[PDB]
Short mmCIF file of C-alpha atoms and ligand atoms in Angstrom, two decimals:
data_model
loop_
_atom_site.label_atom_id
_atom_site.label_comp_id
_atom_site.label_asym_id
_atom_site.label_seq_id
_atom_site.Cartn_x
_atom_site.Cartn_y
_atom_site.Cartn_z
CA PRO A 1 21.40 -66.86 -28.00
CA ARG A 2 19.54 -69.60 -26.09
CA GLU A 3 20.47 -72.36 -28.57
CA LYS A 4 24.22 -71.61 -28.66
CA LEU A 5 24.40 -71.49 -24.84
CA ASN A 6 22.82 -74.97 -24.70
CA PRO A 7 24.88 -76.92 -27.27
CA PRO A 8 24.20 -80.61 -27.99
CA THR A 9 26.51 -83.09 -26.24
CA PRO A 10 28.85 -85.04 -28.58
CA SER A 11 27.59 -88.63 -28.63
CA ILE A 12 28.66 -91.94 -30.20
CA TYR A 13 27.25 -95.46 -30.33
CA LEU A 14 29.55 -98.36 -31.23
CA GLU A 15 27.50 -100.81 -33.34
CA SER A 16 30.28 -103.41 -33.12
CA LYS A 17 33.64 -104.11 -31.46
CA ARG A 18 35.40 -102.98 -34.67
CA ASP A 19 33.96 -99.46 -34.28
CA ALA A 20 35.56 -99.02 -30.83
CA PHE A 21 39.06 -99.63 -32.26
CA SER A 22 38.49 -97.31 -35.25
CA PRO A 23 40.91 -94.37 -35.75
CA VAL A 24 37.77 -92.22 -36.28
CA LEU A 25 36.85 -92.68 -32.59
CA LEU A 26 40.24 -91.32 -31.47
CA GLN A 27 40.11 -88.17 -33.61
CA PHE A 28 36.50 -87.51 -32.55
CA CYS A 29 37.28 -87.84 -28.82
CA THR A 30 40.47 -85.75 -29.07
CA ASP A 31 39.07 -83.07 -31.43
CA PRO A 32 39.52 -79.65 -29.72
CA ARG A 33 35.98 -78.80 -30.92
CA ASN A 34 34.65 -81.67 -28.76
CA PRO A 35 35.32 -80.75 -25.11
CA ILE A 36 33.44 -83.82 -23.86
CA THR A 37 32.24 -87.05 -25.52
CA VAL A 38 29.75 -89.60 -24.20
CA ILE A 39 30.04 -93.08 -25.73
CA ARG A 40 26.63 -94.72 -25.32
CA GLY A 41 26.61 -98.43 -24.41
CA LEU A 42 30.40 -98.80 -24.57
CA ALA A 43 30.37 -101.59 -21.96
CA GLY A 44 27.98 -103.75 -24.00
CA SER A 45 29.72 -103.08 -27.32
CA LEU A 46 33.05 -104.26 -25.85
CA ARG A 47 31.44 -106.86 -23.55
CA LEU A 48 32.88 -105.21 -20.43
CA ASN A 49 31.97 -107.09 -17.26
CA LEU A 50 30.83 -104.10 -15.19
CA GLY A 51 29.54 -106.56 -12.56
CA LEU A 52 33.17 -106.74 -11.41
CA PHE A 53 32.78 -103.10 -10.27
CA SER A 54 29.40 -103.66 -8.57
CA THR A 55 29.17 -102.81 -4.87
CA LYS A 56 28.63 -106.48 -3.96
CA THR A 57 31.78 -107.52 -5.88
CA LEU A 58 33.83 -104.66 -4.40
CA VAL A 59 32.81 -105.61 -0.85
CA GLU A 60 33.78 -109.23 -1.59
CA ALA A 61 37.13 -108.14 -3.09
CA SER A 62 38.20 -105.73 -0.33
CA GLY A 63 35.57 -104.93 2.31
CA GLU A 64 38.05 -103.14 4.61
CA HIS A 65 39.43 -100.90 1.82
CA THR A 66 39.64 -97.23 2.73
CA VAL A 67 36.88 -94.94 1.45
CA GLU A 68 37.24 -91.16 1.67
CA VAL A 69 33.77 -89.90 2.63
CA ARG A 70 32.45 -86.44 1.76
CA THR A 71 29.45 -85.40 3.84
CA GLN A 72 27.19 -83.09 1.83
CA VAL A 73 23.78 -81.43 1.89
CA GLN A 74 21.62 -82.95 -0.86
CA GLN A 75 20.29 -80.41 -3.37
CA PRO A 76 19.18 -80.22 -7.04
CA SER A 77 21.96 -80.30 -9.65
CA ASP A 78 21.18 -76.70 -10.69
CA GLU A 79 21.26 -75.36 -7.10
CA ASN A 80 23.82 -74.46 -4.44
CA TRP A 81 22.30 -72.57 -1.51
CA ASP A 82 23.73 -70.26 1.11
CA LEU A 83 23.14 -71.00 4.81
CA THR A 84 19.93 -68.91 4.82
CA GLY A 85 18.65 -70.66 1.67
CA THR A 86 17.72 -67.45 -0.15
CA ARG A 87 20.42 -67.14 -2.84
CA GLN A 88 22.83 -69.17 -4.98
CA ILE A 89 26.53 -69.31 -4.04
CA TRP A 90 29.67 -70.71 -5.72
CA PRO A 91 31.48 -72.34 -2.79
CA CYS A 92 30.37 -75.94 -2.15
CA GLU A 93 32.18 -77.17 0.95
CA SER A 94 32.09 -80.71 2.35
CA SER A 95 33.30 -82.32 5.58
CA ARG A 96 35.96 -85.02 5.09
CA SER A 97 35.93 -88.32 6.99
CA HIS A 98 36.95 -91.95 6.36
CA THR A 99 35.20 -95.30 6.29
CA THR A 100 35.39 -98.69 4.54
CA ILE A 101 33.90 -100.03 1.30
CA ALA A 102 31.81 -102.53 3.29
CA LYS A 103 30.44 -99.76 5.54
CA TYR A 104 29.70 -97.34 2.69
CA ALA A 105 28.15 -100.26 0.75
CA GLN A 106 25.69 -100.88 3.60
CA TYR A 107 24.81 -97.17 3.63
CA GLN A 108 24.46 -97.25 -0.16
CA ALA A 109 22.32 -100.42 -0.03
CA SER A 110 20.12 -99.50 2.95
CA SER A 111 19.58 -95.99 1.57
CA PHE A 112 18.37 -97.60 -1.69
CA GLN A 113 15.89 -99.77 0.26
CA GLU A 114 14.61 -96.76 2.27
CA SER A 115 13.17 -95.30 -0.95
CA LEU A 116 11.48 -98.66 -1.75
CA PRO A 117 16.80 -89.10 -3.36
CA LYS A 118 18.13 -90.64 -0.13
CA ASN A 119 19.34 -90.01 3.44
CA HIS A 120 16.90 -87.05 3.60
CA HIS A 121 18.85 -83.78 3.54
CA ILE A 122 22.38 -84.82 4.45
CA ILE A 123 24.18 -87.45 2.34
CA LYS A 124 27.59 -89.14 2.12
CA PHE A 125 29.71 -89.54 -1.02
CA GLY A 126 32.34 -92.30 -1.14
CA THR A 127 35.28 -90.83 -3.03
CA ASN A 128 38.90 -91.49 -3.93
CA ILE A 129 38.79 -95.28 -3.59
CA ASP A 130 42.18 -96.64 -4.66
CA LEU A 131 42.18 -99.57 -7.14
CA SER A 132 45.93 -99.43 -7.91
CA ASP A 133 46.82 -102.80 -6.33
CA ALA A 134 47.25 -105.18 -9.29
CA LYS A 135 46.88 -108.38 -7.24
CA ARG A 136 43.93 -107.11 -5.18
CA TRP A 137 41.91 -105.91 -8.20
CA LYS A 138 43.23 -108.31 -10.85
CA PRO A 139 39.95 -109.24 -12.58
CA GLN A 140 38.75 -105.61 -12.42
CA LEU A 141 41.88 -104.14 -14.04
CA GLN A 142 42.21 -106.96 -16.60
CA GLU A 143 38.65 -106.17 -17.72
CA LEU A 144 39.67 -102.61 -18.65
CA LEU A 145 42.22 -104.00 -21.16
CA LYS A 146 39.25 -104.58 -23.53
CA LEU A 147 39.06 -100.81 -24.12
CA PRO A 148 40.75 -99.29 -27.20
CA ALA A 149 44.42 -98.37 -26.75
CA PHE A 150 44.00 -94.60 -26.29
CA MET A 151 41.47 -95.07 -23.44
CA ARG A 152 43.42 -97.74 -21.51
CA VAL A 153 45.09 -97.15 -18.15
CA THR A 154 48.43 -98.00 -19.79
CA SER A 155 49.40 -97.49 -23.45
CA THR A 156 52.44 -96.34 -25.45
CA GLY A 157 50.47 -93.31 -26.70
CA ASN A 158 49.64 -92.20 -23.13
CA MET A 159 52.06 -89.67 -21.55
CA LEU A 160 51.10 -90.98 -18.10
CA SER A 161 52.51 -94.39 -19.15
CA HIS A 162 55.94 -92.77 -19.62
CA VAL A 163 56.16 -91.31 -16.13
CA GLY A 164 57.94 -94.46 -14.89
CA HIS A 165 56.08 -94.67 -11.58
CA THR A 166 52.63 -94.53 -10.01
CA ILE A 167 50.76 -91.22 -10.00
CA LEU A 168 47.77 -92.14 -7.80
CA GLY A 169 44.48 -91.57 -9.63
CA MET A 170 45.93 -90.58 -13.01
CA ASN A 171 47.72 -93.74 -14.20
CA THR A 172 45.87 -95.87 -11.66
CA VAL A 173 42.10 -96.39 -11.43
CA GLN A 174 39.95 -94.55 -8.86
CA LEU A 175 36.49 -95.74 -7.79
CA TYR A 176 33.58 -93.54 -6.68
CA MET A 177 30.55 -94.90 -4.79
CA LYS A 178 27.53 -92.61 -4.88
CA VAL A 179 24.02 -92.02 -3.55
CA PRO A 180 21.54 -89.58 -5.17
CA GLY A 181 22.89 -86.02 -4.89
CA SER A 182 26.54 -87.05 -4.41
CA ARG A 183 28.25 -83.97 -5.82
CA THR A 184 31.60 -83.59 -7.59
CA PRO A 185 32.73 -79.91 -7.45
CA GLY A 186 33.95 -78.15 -10.61
CA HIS A 187 37.49 -78.54 -11.91
CA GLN A 188 39.92 -79.09 -14.70
CA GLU A 189 42.00 -82.27 -14.45
CA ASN A 190 45.52 -82.24 -12.98
CA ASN A 191 47.72 -80.56 -15.63
CA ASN A 192 44.73 -80.42 -18.03
CA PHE A 193 45.04 -84.14 -18.85
CA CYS A 194 42.14 -85.97 -20.49
CA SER A 195 40.03 -88.32 -18.38
CA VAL A 196 37.91 -91.43 -18.80
CA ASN A 197 34.84 -92.05 -16.65
CA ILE A 198 32.62 -95.15 -16.79
CA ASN A 199 29.28 -95.33 -14.98
CA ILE A 200 28.82 -98.79 -13.44
CA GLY A 201 25.20 -98.03 -12.47
CA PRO A 202 22.54 -98.91 -11.58
CA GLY A 203 21.73 -95.17 -11.50
CA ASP A 204 22.62 -92.19 -13.69
CA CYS A 205 25.08 -89.32 -13.35
CA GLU A 206 24.31 -85.79 -14.49
CA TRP A 207 27.25 -83.99 -16.12
CA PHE A 208 28.06 -80.35 -16.71
CA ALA A 209 30.92 -79.13 -18.90
CA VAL A 210 32.47 -75.96 -20.33
CA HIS A 211 35.15 -75.75 -23.04
CA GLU A 212 38.73 -75.12 -21.91
CA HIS A 213 38.60 -71.74 -23.72
CA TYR A 214 36.43 -70.27 -20.95
CA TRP A 215 38.46 -71.46 -17.91
CA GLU A 216 39.82 -68.02 -16.97
CA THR A 217 36.27 -66.65 -16.74
CA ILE A 218 35.37 -69.57 -14.45
CA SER A 219 38.48 -68.82 -12.36
CA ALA A 220 37.48 -65.13 -12.06
CA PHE A 221 34.03 -66.14 -10.77
CA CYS A 222 35.73 -68.31 -8.13
CA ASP A 223 37.95 -65.37 -7.12
CA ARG A 224 34.92 -63.03 -7.12
CA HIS A 225 33.02 -65.53 -4.93
CA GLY A 226 35.89 -66.19 -2.53
CA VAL A 227 37.04 -69.69 -3.50
CA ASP A 228 40.33 -71.06 -4.90
CA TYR A 229 39.76 -72.10 -8.52
CA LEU A 230 42.59 -74.64 -8.79
CA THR A 231 42.33 -76.19 -5.31
CA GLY A 232 38.98 -75.13 -3.77
CA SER A 233 35.49 -76.68 -3.90
CA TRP A 234 32.93 -74.83 -6.04
CA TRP A 235 29.74 -75.27 -8.02
CA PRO A 236 29.01 -72.88 -10.86
CA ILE A 237 25.85 -70.79 -10.81
CA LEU A 238 24.41 -71.55 -14.25
CA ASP A 239 22.81 -68.11 -14.72
CA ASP A 240 26.21 -66.46 -14.14
CA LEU A 241 27.69 -68.62 -16.92
CA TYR A 242 24.81 -67.86 -19.33
CA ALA A 243 25.02 -64.17 -18.36
CA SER A 244 28.70 -64.31 -19.42
CA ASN A 245 27.75 -65.99 -22.74
CA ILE A 246 29.47 -69.26 -21.74
CA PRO A 247 27.98 -72.37 -23.37
CA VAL A 248 27.32 -75.19 -20.90
CA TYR A 249 27.14 -78.81 -22.05
CA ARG A 250 24.56 -80.84 -20.13
CA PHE A 251 23.95 -84.58 -20.42
CA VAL A 252 23.15 -87.76 -18.50
CA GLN A 253 25.66 -90.59 -18.11
CA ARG A 254 23.71 -93.83 -17.91
CA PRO A 255 25.09 -97.23 -16.79
CA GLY A 256 27.67 -98.58 -19.25
CA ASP A 257 28.29 -95.17 -20.84
CA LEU A 258 31.90 -93.98 -21.03
CA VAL A 259 32.46 -90.24 -20.71
CA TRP A 260 35.64 -88.94 -22.36
CA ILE A 261 36.65 -85.54 -21.04
CA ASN A 262 38.95 -83.72 -23.47
CA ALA A 263 42.01 -81.71 -22.38
CA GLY A 264 41.27 -78.74 -20.12
CA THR A 265 37.49 -79.18 -20.16
CA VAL A 266 35.93 -77.66 -17.04
CA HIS A 267 33.32 -80.02 -15.57
CA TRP A 268 31.16 -80.79 -12.57
CA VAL A 269 29.04 -83.84 -11.80
CA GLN A 270 26.14 -85.00 -9.61
CA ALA A 271 24.72 -88.50 -9.15
CA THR A 272 20.98 -88.61 -9.93
CA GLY A 273 20.61 -92.18 -8.65
CA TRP A 274 22.63 -94.78 -6.77
CA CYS A 275 25.74 -95.65 -8.74
CA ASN A 276 29.45 -96.38 -8.85
CA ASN A 277 31.90 -94.67 -11.21
CA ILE A 278 35.43 -95.70 -12.18
CA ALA A 279 37.93 -93.21 -13.59
CA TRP A 280 41.51 -92.44 -14.58
CA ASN A 281 43.47 -89.96 -16.65
CA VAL A 282 45.09 -90.22 -20.07
CA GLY A 283 47.58 -87.92 -21.81
CA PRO A 284 47.40 -88.50 -25.56
CA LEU A 285 50.65 -87.64 -27.34
CA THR A 286 49.32 -84.62 -29.26
CA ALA A 287 50.34 -80.96 -29.59
CA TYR A 288 46.97 -79.92 -28.14
CA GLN A 289 47.31 -82.03 -24.98
CA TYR A 290 51.02 -81.26 -24.49
CA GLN A 291 50.51 -77.49 -24.84
CA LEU A 292 47.60 -77.44 -22.36
CA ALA A 293 49.60 -79.63 -19.95
CA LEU A 294 52.72 -77.41 -20.01
CA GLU A 295 50.84 -74.13 -19.55
CA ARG A 296 48.94 -75.48 -16.52
CA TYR A 297 52.28 -76.85 -15.29
CA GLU A 298 53.66 -73.29 -15.44
CA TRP A 299 50.46 -71.64 -14.13
CA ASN A 300 50.60 -74.06 -11.20
CA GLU A 301 54.07 -72.69 -10.41
CA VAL A 302 52.73 -69.10 -10.40
CA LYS A 303 49.95 -70.07 -7.94
CA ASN A 304 52.19 -72.29 -5.75
CA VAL A 305 50.21 -75.46 -6.55
CA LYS A 306 51.86 -78.86 -7.00
CA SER A 307 51.78 -80.23 -10.54
CA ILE A 308 50.87 -83.88 -9.92
CA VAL A 309 52.32 -84.77 -13.33
CA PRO A 310 56.08 -84.03 -13.38
CA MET A 311 56.09 -82.64 -16.92
CA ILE A 312 59.87 -82.18 -17.27
CA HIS A 313 60.52 -85.76 -16.15
CA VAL A 314 57.77 -86.98 -18.48
CA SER A 315 59.05 -85.03 -21.50
CA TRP A 316 62.51 -86.62 -21.20
CA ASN A 317 61.14 -90.15 -20.86
CA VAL A 318 58.85 -89.55 -23.85
CA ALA A 319 61.80 -88.21 -25.86
CA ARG A 320 63.97 -91.22 -24.94
CA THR A 321 61.57 -93.95 -26.15
CA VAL A 322 58.73 -92.53 -28.31
CA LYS A 323 58.98 -91.49 -31.97
CA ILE A 324 57.02 -88.27 -32.60
CA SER A 325 55.78 -87.73 -36.17
CA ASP A 326 53.82 -84.51 -35.56
CA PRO A 327 56.02 -81.43 -36.23
CA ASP A 328 54.06 -79.18 -33.84
CA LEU A 329 54.31 -81.63 -30.92
CA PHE A 330 57.99 -82.29 -31.69
CA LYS A 331 58.80 -78.56 -31.60
CA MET A 332 57.12 -78.21 -28.19
CA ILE A 333 58.92 -81.18 -26.60
CA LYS A 334 62.26 -80.25 -28.22
CA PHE A 335 61.97 -76.73 -26.79
CA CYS A 336 61.00 -77.96 -23.32
CA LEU A 337 64.03 -80.29 -23.29
CA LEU A 338 66.41 -77.52 -24.42
CA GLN A 339 65.12 -75.17 -21.70
CA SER A 340 65.62 -77.93 -19.12
CA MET A 341 69.23 -78.51 -20.25
CA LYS A 342 69.97 -74.78 -20.01
CA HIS A 343 68.35 -74.62 -16.56
CA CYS A 344 70.45 -77.51 -15.28
CA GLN A 345 73.58 -75.93 -16.78
CA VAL A 346 72.94 -72.60 -15.02
CA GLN A 347 72.58 -74.41 -11.67
CA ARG A 348 75.83 -76.36 -12.14
CA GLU A 349 77.85 -73.27 -13.10
CA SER A 350 76.58 -71.29 -10.09
CA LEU A 351 77.31 -74.23 -7.76
CA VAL A 352 80.84 -74.59 -9.17
CA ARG A 353 81.45 -70.83 -8.82
CA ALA A 354 80.41 -71.02 -5.14
CA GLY A 355 82.84 -73.93 -4.61
CA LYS A 356 79.98 -76.29 -3.79
CA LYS A 357 80.39 -80.00 -4.56
CA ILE A 358 77.99 -81.97 -6.77
CA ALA A 359 77.85 -85.76 -6.32
CA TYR A 360 76.55 -88.01 -9.10
CA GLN A 361 73.56 -89.93 -7.73
CA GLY A 362 72.22 -91.62 -10.87
CA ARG A 363 68.73 -93.02 -11.43
CA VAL A 364 67.32 -96.35 -10.23
CA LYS A 365 64.37 -98.42 -11.48
CA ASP A 366 60.90 -97.27 -10.35
CA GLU A 367 62.39 -94.11 -8.76
CA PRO A 368 59.87 -91.28 -8.33
CA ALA A 369 60.21 -87.73 -9.65
CA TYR A 370 61.19 -85.28 -6.91
CA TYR A 371 59.39 -82.16 -5.69
CA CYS A 372 60.47 -79.33 -3.38
CA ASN A 373 59.62 -79.83 0.31
CA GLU A 374 58.73 -76.13 0.70
CA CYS A 375 57.19 -74.84 -2.55
CA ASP A 376 56.16 -78.19 -4.15
CA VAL A 377 57.79 -77.36 -7.53
CA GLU A 378 59.24 -80.20 -9.61
CA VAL A 379 62.97 -80.57 -8.89
CA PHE A 380 64.51 -82.14 -12.01
CA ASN A 381 68.04 -83.61 -12.16
CA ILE A 382 69.86 -81.32 -9.70
CA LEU A 383 68.65 -82.21 -6.20
CA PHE A 384 69.37 -80.09 -3.12
CA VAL A 385 69.06 -82.65 -0.32
CA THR A 386 69.04 -82.36 3.49
CA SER A 387 68.60 -84.73 6.44
CA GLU A 388 65.73 -83.77 8.77
CA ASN A 389 66.29 -86.57 11.29
CA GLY A 390 69.57 -87.35 13.07
CA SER A 391 69.81 -90.65 11.18
CA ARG A 392 69.87 -91.04 7.38
CA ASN A 393 66.26 -92.29 7.23
CA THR A 394 64.48 -89.02 6.42
CA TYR A 395 65.81 -87.20 3.34
CA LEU A 396 64.14 -83.99 2.12
CA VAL A 397 64.55 -82.70 -1.44
CA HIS A 398 64.51 -78.92 -2.02
CA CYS A 399 64.67 -76.66 -5.06
CA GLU A 400 67.59 -74.26 -5.65
CA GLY A 401 65.73 -71.20 -4.35
CA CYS A 402 64.40 -72.85 -1.19
CA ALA A 403 67.79 -74.47 -0.50
CA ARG A 404 69.47 -71.05 -0.78
CA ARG A 405 66.71 -69.56 1.43
CA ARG A 406 67.76 -71.73 4.41
CA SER A 407 69.30 -69.89 7.39
CA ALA A 408 72.70 -71.58 6.89
CA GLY A 409 72.48 -71.42 3.07
CA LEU A 410 73.86 -74.57 1.42
CA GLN A 411 75.75 -75.67 4.57
CA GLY A 412 74.43 -79.13 5.47
CA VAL A 413 72.83 -79.44 2.03
CA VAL A 414 74.22 -82.17 -0.24
CA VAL A 415 73.73 -81.45 -3.95
CA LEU A 416 73.05 -84.48 -6.16
CA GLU A 417 73.05 -84.89 -9.95
CA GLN A 418 70.85 -87.62 -11.46
CA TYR A 419 71.69 -86.97 -15.13
CA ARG A 420 75.09 -85.74 -16.37
CA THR A 421 75.16 -83.07 -19.08
CA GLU A 422 76.20 -85.78 -21.57
CA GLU A 423 73.22 -88.01 -20.67
CA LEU A 424 70.77 -85.19 -21.42
CA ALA A 425 72.69 -84.01 -24.50
CA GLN A 426 72.82 -87.51 -26.02
CA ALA A 427 69.13 -88.14 -25.30
CA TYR A 428 68.34 -84.69 -26.73
CA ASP A 429 70.31 -85.19 -29.97
CA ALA A 430 68.74 -88.65 -30.41
CA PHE A 431 65.27 -87.07 -30.21
CA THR A 432 64.36 -86.36 -33.86
CA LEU A 433 61.12 -85.88 -35.83
CA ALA A 434 59.78 -89.20 -37.17
CA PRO A 435 58.97 -89.55 -40.90
O1 YC8 B 1 36.71 -85.82 -8.52
C1 YC8 B 1 35.84 -86.60 -8.17
C2 YC8 B 1 35.67 -86.93 -6.71
C3 YC8 B 1 35.07 -85.73 -5.97
C4 YC8 B 1 35.17 -85.90 -4.46
C5 YC8 B 1 34.86 -84.62 -3.73
C6 YC8 B 1 35.89 -83.73 -3.41
C7 YC8 B 1 35.61 -82.55 -2.73
C8 YC8 B 1 34.30 -82.25 -2.36
C9 YC8 B 1 33.28 -83.13 -2.67
C10 YC8 B 1 33.56 -84.32 -3.36
N1 YC8 B 1 34.98 -87.19 -9.01
C11 YC8 B 1 34.88 -86.94 -10.42
C12 YC8 B 1 35.76 -86.09 -11.12
N2 YC8 B 1 35.65 -85.84 -12.44
C13 YC8 B 1 34.65 -86.44 -13.11
C14 YC8 B 1 33.73 -87.30 -12.52
C15 YC8 B 1 33.83 -87.56 -11.16
C16 YC8 B 1 32.84 -88.47 -10.49
O2 YC8 B 1 32.58 -88.32 -9.31
O3 YC8 B 1 32.30 -89.42 -11.25
CO1 CO B 2 37.30 -84.77 -13.44
MG1 MG B 3 40.00 -83.14 -6.83
MG1 MG B 4 44.48 -71.61 -23.78
ZN1 ZN B 5 61.23 -74.77 -3.48
#
């Protein structure tokens, strides 16, 4: 039906500051039935100084900051043309280049003055601007502390705050600078984590969204139309989605509106006017989020795609410090930890059978999680390490399989252990369901 395929977008207005910190807001935003939530006038309700994220202020703060530019052909939000301009296509490719905030700002500003749409046919979209530097963006980041706990960049209830190190763009803030038509290709978030997006303005963003439930159908369209779902750049053809009985949420994000994207929600975005957007990810400690995160973590492994969130590392840290009261979530984490212990044990036994030494490395403060140099899989605890350079400057971490796959096998490879069996066992036994 036409009505069901065009469902109303979940919306909230906060009449006061008290409403923003209400438990009702959390359960609404995280409800699996709500794939996306727009909070109207959130900035004003919480008195957020969005002027700190204005183009003028950003240029003053760091004019030489790196801006990743995406050159694009401008086209209506419901269109993506082939080279002949006679049919709709899924792939939406863009050329990548680099510039500065100051230089993109001038393009953004001049372009705005040209119209008394912009840049004619071809436009540039300033993406992936890094606001992780605490000293450089102090007033900007401090301003975001006015948000309720579950939406903050850092909180005890956010899985990404238990990683122990920086994951660029997930537990640090990214800035987008846009002109009309600036297009954000379709995707789910890294490891199906939730996301927060605030429109700074002055212009609007147009949003499109599909519930996580339909993601495999979206992936099959991408495969049918010759583009990588997880890693490629694509723009859904809306008629294809409606022809497959897939409801599409459509709404406008006006200046000061916060968009909350729930776990696994497929979404694509286009700027209607000139605007800046700020964004980051959040991983609420719930069974719904954890399940979706683990299954993308595994699916990533099947498709040889790096999981940007090291879910095994995160699950252990969470287990070590956070009390989980939900039985369903506890079961999932407890199982993940047990599987990890068994996996580590199997590796140690095989290494000891082969007569291969294992040195205890230990962990240090602010140490990153390790990934395989070849296949990009998370390498937890047992590290197969080699020296690429003649000196001890360049160390490469490999997984068991890739280490074994080397021409000389494990010769030259030093095997390290970051957590002893007893460390994991004692952390595991300490992890119990909260009352
Ligand atoms: O991912 C991005 C940056 C897209 C940059 C890009 C990459 C590849 C091709 C064109 C543009 N942006 C968003 C993601 N999710 C929600 C909203 C946005 C946004 O642009 O406000
Ligand atoms: Co997104
Ligand atoms: Mg991306
Ligand atoms: Mg599912
Ligand atoms: Zn590997």
